[PDB]
Design an enzyme around this catalytic site. Structure first.
Site, PDB file in Angstrom:
ATOM      1  N   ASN A 106      -9.729  -6.516  11.224  1.00  0.00           N
ATOM      2  CA  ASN A 106      -8.203  -6.870  10.882  1.00  0.00           C
ATOM      3  C   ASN A 106      -7.793  -6.391   9.238  1.00  0.00           C
ATOM      4  OD1 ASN A 106      -6.296  -9.200   9.972  1.00  0.00           O
ATOM      5  ND2 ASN A 106      -5.843  -8.354  12.054  1.00  0.00           N
ATOM      6  N   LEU A 164      -4.864  -4.394 -15.739  1.00  0.00           N
ATOM      7  CA  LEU A 164      -3.331  -3.800 -15.592  1.00  0.00           C
ATOM      8  C   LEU A 164      -2.405  -4.284 -16.750  1.00  0.00           C
ATOM      9  CD1 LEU A 164      -1.116  -2.726 -14.023  1.00  0.00           C
ATOM     10  CD2 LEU A 164      -0.960  -4.582 -12.927  1.00  0.00           C
ATOM     11  N   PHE A 218      -8.372  -9.808  -7.592  1.00  0.00           N
ATOM     12  CA  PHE A 218      -8.168  -8.886  -8.923  1.00  0.00           C
ATOM     13  C   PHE A 218      -7.607  -7.829  -8.667  1.00  0.00           C
ATOM     14  CE2 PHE A 218     -10.533  -8.075 -13.006  1.00  0.00           C
ATOM     15  CZ  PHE A 218     -10.432  -6.741 -12.974  1.00  0.00           C
ATOM     16  N   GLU A 220     -14.183  -0.733 -10.664  1.00  0.00           N
ATOM     17  CA  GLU A 220     -13.001  -0.559 -11.504  1.00  0.00           C
ATOM     18  C   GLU A 220     -13.557   0.445 -12.677  1.00  0.00           C
ATOM     19  OE1 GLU A 220     -10.009  -1.515 -11.332  1.00  0.00           O
ATOM     20  OE2 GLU A 220     -10.202  -3.148  -9.752  1.00  0.00           O
ATOM     21  N   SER A 233      -6.131 -12.262   8.634  1.00  0.00           N
ATOM     22  CA  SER A 233      -7.584 -11.881   8.043  1.00  0.00           C
ATOM     23  C   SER A 233      -8.393 -13.180   7.605  1.00  0.00           C
ATOM     24  CB  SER A 233      -7.460 -10.838   7.000  1.00  0.00           C
ATOM     25  OG  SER A 233      -6.673 -10.011   7.354  1.00  0.00           O
ATOM     26  N   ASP A 261      -3.980   3.437 -13.195  1.00  0.00           N
ATOM     27  CA  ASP A 261      -4.424   3.042 -12.099  1.00  0.00           C
ATOM     28  C   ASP A 261      -4.388   3.758 -11.097  1.00  0.00           C
ATOM     29  OD1 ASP A 261      -2.197   1.693 -11.126  1.00  0.00           O
ATOM     30  OD2 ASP A 261      -2.906  -0.160 -11.603  1.00  0.00           O
TER      31      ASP A 261
END
Length: 162
Positions: free
Chosen positions: A132, A32, A104, A11, A117, A20
Site C-alpha cells: 500500500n 529545506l 522528515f 539525504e 497505510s 532538492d
C-alpha cells in the site's frame, strides 16, 4: 544504525545551497529552506536558521546541528499529532525510524494521505502495508529511497541500508 545515520544516507550532505528532488532550495542534510523560486529568499531563511550571514554556505558542524533540530522536530510533530502518535507508539524502534524518515521528507501534511497505510502498520500487516505504501506519488517520484523505507517497515531490520 539509527535515525541519524538512516537520514544521512538518504539525504547526503551538501554545504552550499542546492535544489532538492522537488526543485526546492535546500542545504546541509536535506534541510529545506523555502519553496519560493527566489534564491535570495532561500539565503534569508538560511541566515535566520544559522544565526549569521552565510551567503549560501555553511560548515559541517552547522549542517549537523540543523539536522539534529530537524530530526527532533519531526519526532515532536509525530508525538503532537493525534493521527500519527498512536501508530508511532505501536511500532518497534526500527520501524519508528522509517516513520520519522517519511515525516522528515514529506512533513505531516505529506503523510496525511497515508491513512490506510498507517492502519495496516498499526495492525502489523507488514507485507500489505508495504504494497500500500508503494501506491503513492512518494514511491513513484523517489522510488529508491521509498523502497529502502518500505523495506524497513516490511522487515523491521536495517537490511536495506546495510
Amino acid at each position: 544504525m539509527n535515525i541519524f545515520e538512516m537520514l544521512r544516507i538518504d539525504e547526503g550532505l551538501r554545504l552550499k545551497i542546492y535544489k532538492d528532488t522537488e526543485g526546492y532550495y535546500t542545504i546541509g542534510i536535506g534541510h529545506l529552506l523555502t519553496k519560493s523560486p527566489s534564491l535570495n529568499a532561500a539565503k534569508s531563511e538560511l541566515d535566520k536558521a544559522i544565526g549569521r550571514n552565510c551567503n549560501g554556505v555553511i560548515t559541517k558542524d552547522e549542517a549537523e546541528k540543523l539536522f539534529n533540530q530537524d530530526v527532533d522536530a519531526a519526532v515532536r510533530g509525530i508525538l503532537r499529532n493525534a493521527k500519527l502518535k498512536p501508530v508511532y507508539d505501536s511500532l518497534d524502534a526500527v520501524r519508528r525510524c522509517a516513520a520519522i524518515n517519511m515525516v522528515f521528507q514529506m512533513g505531516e501534511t505529506g503523510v496525511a494521505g497515508f491513512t490506510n497505510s498507517l492502519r495496516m502498520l498499526q495492525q502489523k500487516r507488514w507485507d500489505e502495508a508495504a504494497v500500500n505504501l508503494a501506491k503513492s506519488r512518494w514511491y513513484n517520484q523517489t522510488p529508491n529511497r521509498a523502497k529502502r523505507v518500505i523495506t524497513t517497515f516490511r522487515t523491521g531490520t536495517w537490511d536495506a541500508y546495510k
